[PDB]
Design a binder for this molecule. Structure first.
Ligand SMILES: Nc1ncnc2c1ncn2[C@@H]1O[C@H](COP(=O)(O)OP(=O)(O)OP(=O)(O)O)[C@@H](O)[C@H]1O
Ligand SMILES: [Mg+2]
Ligand SMILES: [Mg+2]
Length: 485
C-alpha cells in the first residue's frame, strides 16, 4: 500500500488506439472493455509491485460507468463519512464513483488529493484534476472521441476554450488545475467547472493560535501521506521546509530515511546533517558533477513537459536526485512549494510587496507542472508534497503577511510551528551552471535567458513533440545550435 494503484494513464472514450510510451517507469496494464467500442478503453502505467485494481472502478449507476484514477486521495475518512451506507469503496477510483453518485461533478469540490481521473458514464466524459493540478492531465476532444492522458507526449501522435493548448503540440490541451471538464461525447462540447481557487482574503490570528494551527495542519497532511507500516523517504536539504516535513514524517512513521543531493560546486550537507542527527534518521548523501546535472536537461523537460526555462533549470537537481537513488521504489515526501504561500523570497520587513508577489504566484502556478509526479516516477519513485496539500495550502495562503514576515524572519509562522521539533540552528536559518555553459558557448548575456528558452523549447520539441528518448538527445549540440543564433 506504499505506492498508488496507478501513476498515470492513456484512456480513450469512443461513442462509436496504439500503445502509449510514457516517461513514467512501470508496468502497463490494459483494462477490460466489457461495453466493447462503447466503453472506456485505457492503459494504466503503475509500479510492477502493484496490482492496478484500485485504480479502476465500474458501476451501473446512471449508466454503464468506468472510472480510472492516477494518484491517490488524502481526506479519505472525511469522504467516506458523507457516503450512504456501508459497503465501503475498495480504492480511490471507487470512492470517486461513490462520491459522483451523490454530488455528481461537484464531488471534486470535496477531494483533497494528488490525482487525475477520467470517467465515462454513458456518452458523458468527466476529466478532473486535484486542487492544484499537481498530477497533470491532458486531452484531445472531437465529436465522438475523447482521449485523456497523464502525459501530453502520449497524445503527441478540436479547440477547447477553458483549457490551455500544450506548446508545440497540436490539438492537445492541458486540463486546468482544480477543475472538472464535463464533455458530451456525441457533440464534443465541454463545460468546465473550477472546484477550487486560491483565497484572496487574509486571516488574522494571534501567534499562539497561528503557530498551533500550522503545526497541526502540516502534521495531518504528512500523516495522510505516509503509509502505515512503511518508513518514508524525505529529500532533505536542511532548509526549514524539508526539515519541517522530515520532523512530521518521523513522528508519523516512527522512524525516517532521508537523502541530500549535492554537486561539485555546492551542497547543503552540513545543514542537513544537523537535522538527521536531531531526528536520528537513516541518511544518504549524493554528489553529482555539474556536467551530469546539466545532462538532465532533456530528462527534466521530457518528464515535466514544460517549456519554461526557469522551471526546467529549477527541476534539474531533483530529476538528477530521483534518478540517482538506489534500492527499491520509494514513497517520497518533499518540502516543495512552502515558499510560495509563505513569501519565502520576500527579503524586507515591509509587508506590502509580500502580498503582491503572493497573490501573483497563486494566480500563475497552473501549467508550470512544477510538482508533477513524473519527475520522480520516471525512476519508479512516487513523490507527494505536504505544503501544497489543499488544507495546508488554504491555511498558509490565508494568513496575514505579518505572520509570514515577523520578528525580522521570513516564513515566521512555519519556523515557530516547528521550533520544538528541530535544532534552533535549523529553525533560525534564514532562507547558475546553465548560464555558464551557454556563456562558455559564445553567448553574451542579455540573450542568455532567451537562449535557455530556445534550448528548452528545442528539447521539448524533440522529446515531447517528436518522440525521442532523452538518452537519444545530444544536449551539447542543442546548446551549440542555439548559441550560434
Ligand atoms: N539538493 C537537494 N537535496 C535534498 N532535497 C532537495 C535538494 N534540492 C531540492 N530539494 C527538495 O526540493 C524542495 C525545494 O526547495 P528549497 O530550495 O526552497 O529549500 P527548503 O528545504 O524547501 O527550505 P528553504 O526554502 O527555506 O531553503 C525542498 O523542499 C527539498 O525537499
Ligand atoms: Mg532550500
Ligand atoms: Mg522551500
Amino acid at each position: 500500500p506504499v505506492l498508488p494503484a496507478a501513476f498515470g494513464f492513456l484512456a480513450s472514450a469512443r461513442t462509436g488506439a496504439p500503445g502509449p510510451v510514457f516517461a513514467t517507469r512501470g508496468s502497463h496494464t490494459d483494462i477490460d472493455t466489457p461495453q466493447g467500442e462503447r466503453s472506456l478503453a485505457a492503459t494504466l502505467v503503475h509500479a510492477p509491485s502493484v496490482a492496478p485494481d484500485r485504480a479502476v472502478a465500474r458501476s451501473l449507476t446512471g449508466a454503464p460507468t468506468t472510472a480510472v484514477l492516477a494518484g491517490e486521495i488524502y481526506n479519505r475518512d472525511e469522504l467516506l463519512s458523507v457516503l450512504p451506507a456501508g459497503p465501503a469503496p475498495e480504492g480511490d477510483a471507487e470512492l470517486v464513483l461513490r462520491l459522483l453518485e451523490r454530488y455528481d461533478l461537484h464531488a471534486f469540490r470535496l477531494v483533497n488529493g494528488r490525482f487525475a481521473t477520467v470517467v465515462r458514464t454513458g456518452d458523458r466524459v468527466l476529466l478532473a484534476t486535484d486542487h492544484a493540478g499537481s498530477v497533470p492531465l491532458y486531452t484531445c476532444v472531437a465529436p465522438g472521441e475523447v482521449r485523456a492522458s497523464t502525459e501530453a507526449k502520449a497524445l503527441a501522435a478540436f479547440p477547447l476554450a477553458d483549457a490551455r493548448r500544450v506548446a508545440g503540440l497540436t490539438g492537445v490541451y492541458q486540463v486546468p488545475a482544480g477543475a472538472v471538464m464535463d464533455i458530451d461525447l456525441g457533440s464534443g462540447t465541454a463545460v468546465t467547472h473550477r472546484t477550487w481557487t486560491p483565497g484572496l482574503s487574509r486571516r488574522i490570528l494571534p501567534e499562539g493560535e497561528a503557530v498551533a494551527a500550522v503545526r497541526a495542519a502540516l502534521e495531518k497532511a504528512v500523516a495522510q501521506r505516509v503509509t502505515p507500516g512503511d518508513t518514508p523517504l524525505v529529500v532533505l536539504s536542511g532548509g526549514i521546509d524539508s526539515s519541517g516535513v522530515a520532523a512530521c514524517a518521523h513522528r508519523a512513521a516512527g522512524e525516517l530515511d532521508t537523502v541530500s543531493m549535492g554537486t561539485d560546486t555546492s551542497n547543503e550537507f552540513r545543514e542537513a546533517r544537523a537535522v538527521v542527527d536531531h531526528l536520528r534518521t537513516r541518511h544518504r548523501e549524493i554528489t553529482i558533477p555539474t556536467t551530469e546535472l546539466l545532462a538532465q536537461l532533456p530528462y527534466a523537460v521530457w518528464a515535466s513537459e514544460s517549456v519554461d526555462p526557469d522551471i526546467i533549470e529549477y527541476l534539474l537537481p531533483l530529476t538528477a536526485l530521483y534518478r540517482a537513488l538506489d534500492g527499491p521504489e520509494r514513497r517520497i515526501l518533499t518540502g516543495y512549494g512552502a515558499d510560495i504561500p509563505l513569501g519565502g523570497m520576500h527579503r524586507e520587513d515591509r509587508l506590502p510587496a509580500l502580498d503582491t508577489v503572493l497573490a501573483h504566484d497563486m494566480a500563475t502556478f497552473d501549467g508550470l507542472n512544477e510538482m508533477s509526479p513524473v519527475l520522480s516516477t520516471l525512476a519508479g519513485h512516487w513523490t507527494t508534497h505536504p505544503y501544497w496539500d489543499r488544507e495546508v495550502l488554504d491555511l498558509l495562503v490565508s494568513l496575514e503577511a505579518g505572520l509570514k514576515r515577523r520578528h525580522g524572519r521570513d516564513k515566521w509562522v512555519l519556523r515557530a510551528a516547528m521550533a520544538d521539533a528541530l535544532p534552533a540552528e535549523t529553525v533560525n536559518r534564514p532562507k547558475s551552471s546553465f548560464s555558464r555553459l551557454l556563456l562558455d558557448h559564445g553567448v553574451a548575456e542579455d540573450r542568455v535567458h532567451e537562449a535557455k528558452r530556445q534550448v528548452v523549447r528545442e528539447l521539448f520539441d524533440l522529446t515531447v513533440g517528436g518522440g525521442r528518448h532523452p538518452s537519444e538527445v545530444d544536449t551539447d549540440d542543442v546548446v551549440r545550435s542555439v548559441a550560434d543564433r
